[PDB]
Amino acid sequence: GAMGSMERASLIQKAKLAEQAERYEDMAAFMKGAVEKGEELSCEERNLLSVAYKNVVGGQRAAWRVLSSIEQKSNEEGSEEKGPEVREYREKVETELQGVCDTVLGLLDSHLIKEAGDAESRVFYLKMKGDYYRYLAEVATGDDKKRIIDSARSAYQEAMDISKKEMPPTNPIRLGLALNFSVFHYEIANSPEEAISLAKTTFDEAMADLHTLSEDSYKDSTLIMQLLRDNLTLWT
């Protein structure tokens, strides 16, 4: 690893600098280096890892969507043939996106998930595993799509089961997991009713637990509760 010669603490420090500079590729590379030191990540460090890769793959997804839309228009009736270039460049972006997803899933499998015993960390990493399989599913077409979808579902489901047993309904990780699993149901798994049911049940049970939620998590949890409401408004 190109980060093998750097101190773990220095990698964490530089990941925080990269975040301030909105250099998310660097941020992800520093956090990958930190993970590869072999020690568990703290709560704050987990958030650096997730934000870095969320932003890298988020930009790739946005670009992939632009290109896929151009490609689909280029394949409509009456559209002029322009050659292989749109497909080629969409494939280039897609392959880069898949590579980043594979990198994240590899970190989770080697060895973040296996060593995570506290509910917070275990749910956090399994949510990430579902997220990155979901991003693989967004671009999957061949004999692989159904297994990729199943892998996303399996990771989200294990996270869900742990979160409901070990976390209060207002826990931000629990809430964010439910938000994203509900989007998985709506956008990936062709299950809008399950998506709506999950979002509503999650929102309602969090509302009833707010009379105990922290001022620390309030803004995160209210943000996510509002995102659940936003999605329900989009869907109904």
Binding site: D131, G176, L179, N180, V183, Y186, E187, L223, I224, L227, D230, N231, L234, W235
Partner: peptide
């Protein structure tokens, strides 16, 4: 697109 976190 719907919101995720």
């Amino acid at each position: 697109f719907p919101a995720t976190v």
